[PDB]
Amino acid sequence: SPLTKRVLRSYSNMREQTQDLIDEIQLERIAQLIEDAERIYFFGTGSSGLVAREMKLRFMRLGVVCEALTDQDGFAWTTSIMDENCLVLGFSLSGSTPSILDSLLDAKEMGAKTVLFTSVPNKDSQTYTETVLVATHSQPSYIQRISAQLPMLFFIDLIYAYFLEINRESKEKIFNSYWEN
Amino acid sequence: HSPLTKRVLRSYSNMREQTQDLIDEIQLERIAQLIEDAERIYFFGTGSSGLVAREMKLRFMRLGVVCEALTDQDGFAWTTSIMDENCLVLGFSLSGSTPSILDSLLDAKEMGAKTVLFTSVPNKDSQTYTETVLVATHSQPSYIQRISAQLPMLFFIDLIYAYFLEINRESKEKIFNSYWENKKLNGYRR
Amino acid sequence: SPLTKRVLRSYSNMREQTQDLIDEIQLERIAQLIEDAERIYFFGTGSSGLVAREMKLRFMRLGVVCEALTDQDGFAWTTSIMDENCLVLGFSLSGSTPSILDSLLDAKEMGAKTVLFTSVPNKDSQTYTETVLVATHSQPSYIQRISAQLPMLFFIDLIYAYFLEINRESKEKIFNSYWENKKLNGY
Amino acid sequence: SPLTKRVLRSYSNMREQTQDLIDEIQLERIAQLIEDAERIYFFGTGSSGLVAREMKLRFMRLGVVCEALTDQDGFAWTTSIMDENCLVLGFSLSGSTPSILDSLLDAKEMGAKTVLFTSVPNKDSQTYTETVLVATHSQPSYIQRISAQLPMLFFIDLIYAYFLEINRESKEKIFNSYWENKKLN
């Protein structure tokens, strides 16, 4: 079908793009930032808010003390209780959502480490501990683009893989207590 | 390149190939007319399947659809009690075994609503439902190494949405674009 | 203990003030607006978002087709699909949260009816369909106030009672269906 | 107007009952338990989940590290990461909602301290660190009852006030940081 083709092309295109963006040493660094962090936070709005919730679900099941926030007040009250043992991962596909960029800046002022995920090379000039570049959507118009989560989910999974192999014995045992009840 | 990076990327590409196989262009085209047809659309799911339900709500409301996503059983119960034949429920259960979802689809049918189930496991119990959409399985046998549980569903969501937007498009594109109108006080501008 | 007495005094004072604020005719009108509307929206942020969510829960069980939204994008996308048959209830205790005031102005431009709940009167609110005055708190310092939901819960409960007596038999049946032996998800 | 009086009587009745049920020493203890805890969890379903969400909002702004959980999957994954530095507050007005009773039991097994809030006493809550009795409602028919949050909000506000006075200076600094010139109010 012609519409079926557009969707599957958008999928393989961002697949094809994601291949070229992957910085494996950056991803293993982030996995280590998570392991070393005491408290970990995921910020995003809209569909990037859904990505942040997905991450909370998966890493909490490997034993991570974390929390997903998806609005401005939640960002403000949460950054006000961060310190140097915290890590914040911010998700913003455009790179331009002010609540996310401002909340990463607030977290940095409190000494937290910061990671921004975005499809737009940052203009902030290496302001955050890390900036993970994700695929851009192929479709030019917002209305026909595929799930905004997808560029982010790729890197979700990649970091998940690297993180699972740090201290896995302790993490597989936490994962499996769910089925064992 | 890395082995871990290697395992993740073939998980993605295998479900791209297995998805490619499972599509039924005409079933998804049908499911698209049911959303237009319904007056009230509900999306039900738990865990990661709830996140899929939340995303459908976000995308279809922006095309003008009256809809709501629910993600625990009490919301299923109270919501099904106000359904009628002009209601459509989409239920998401990758395992196909989550009782809260199967039971609330049975509940929705009782009220006369049309019903669609999304699952990686086929069955004959789902014959009760108006449609059953078959989605890709993951490939990692280890549940803990599987890639994100949303993905088999996001494919078919993207497919149905692609179809849905071409039904009565002018007015759906109007509603979508209003978020960027300069008059919209809570809009993107701000 | 004086702490204990201070908290309890806050609850008593709120209840006294609420009685002094009630306009029963207005509350009856608002009950009627809910019943007449085809779709009802509850808008709030922070503690006022929780108020909105509870109202959605209780009125859904009486058959109302309704939704609670608690952020700016939810407000914008929802107002863009409103019409003459919709009703928006906005909760802002301070009466000044811009997203809420703006969301009701956007709703009004789509033809929808609008109700603002606030503890701070204003002549700017003159533009909405109804303005419901709720109680202020009685602790001068914000950090010692009791829950910010409470002024609103009083009036939600008043509206609920008036509403339940409008075509009650049909609403009590929907509410009772949750306990029906046929109801699978139900307890 | 008989309606208006009924709703107001329900509020007054609950205030009067709440005062009779308060155990001031227990509340100070729970306030001290929250401070002493490293991580605090609030569990509730339905209206009791909104109560838990508001507790999270208010105690976080005083510097508490906490999270609210309002469904069964969330409870299990959270208990599987608890330990002795943890406190969980469980809200069940009926006292009989199984996901709440069970998961609090899981949490004690993990080493966590436990607090059930309920309006129905029971001897099989004697396994928890604390049981806070809250007020029942005063309407016979469930459909005519006031917000189900209210019995819990009374006691949450009591605990809040006790807690605010432990190390108040540092808590007021965190609370006020929301109004400092830093980004995102």
Ligand SMILES: CC(=O)N[C@H]1[C@@H](O)[C@H](O)[C@@H](COP(=O)(O)O)O[C@@H]1O
């Ligand atoms: C272009 C557009 O529609 N944006 C809306 C959402 O689709 C998006 O998910 C969210 C976060 O956007 P991000 O921060 O760029 O991810 O912002 C807006 O809600």
Ligand SMILES: CC(=O)N[C@H]1[C@@H](O)[C@H](O)[C@@H](COP(=O)(O)O)O[C@@H]1O
């Ligand atoms: C299936 C599983 O192992 N773990 C959780 C999620 O990953 C899952 O998405 C959801 C079940 O919903 P399902 O998709 O119908 O299975 O909740 C499960 O507890």
Ligand SMILES: CC(=O)N[C@H]1[C@@H](O)[C@H](O)[C@@H](COP(=O)(O)O)O[C@@H]1O
């Ligand atoms: C002063 C302050 O700290 N306000 C916060 C919340 O306590 C409040 O619930 C919300 C709603 O404000 P409202 O619109 O006046 O109800 O705004 C902020 O999130």
Ligand SMILES: CC(=O)N[C@H]1[C@@H](O)[C@H](O)[C@@H](COP(=O)(O)O)O[C@@H]1O
């Ligand atoms: C009797 C009834 O309708 N119960 C429903 C809710 O109103 C209640 O808020 C929740 C928690 O029950 P609780 O655990 O006793 O607080 O359970 C059910 O959703």
Ligand code: NA
């Ligand atoms: Na695309």
Ligand code: NA
């Ligand atoms: Na896979």
Ligand code: NA
């Ligand atoms: Na007060």
Ligand code: NA
């Ligand atoms: Na009552």
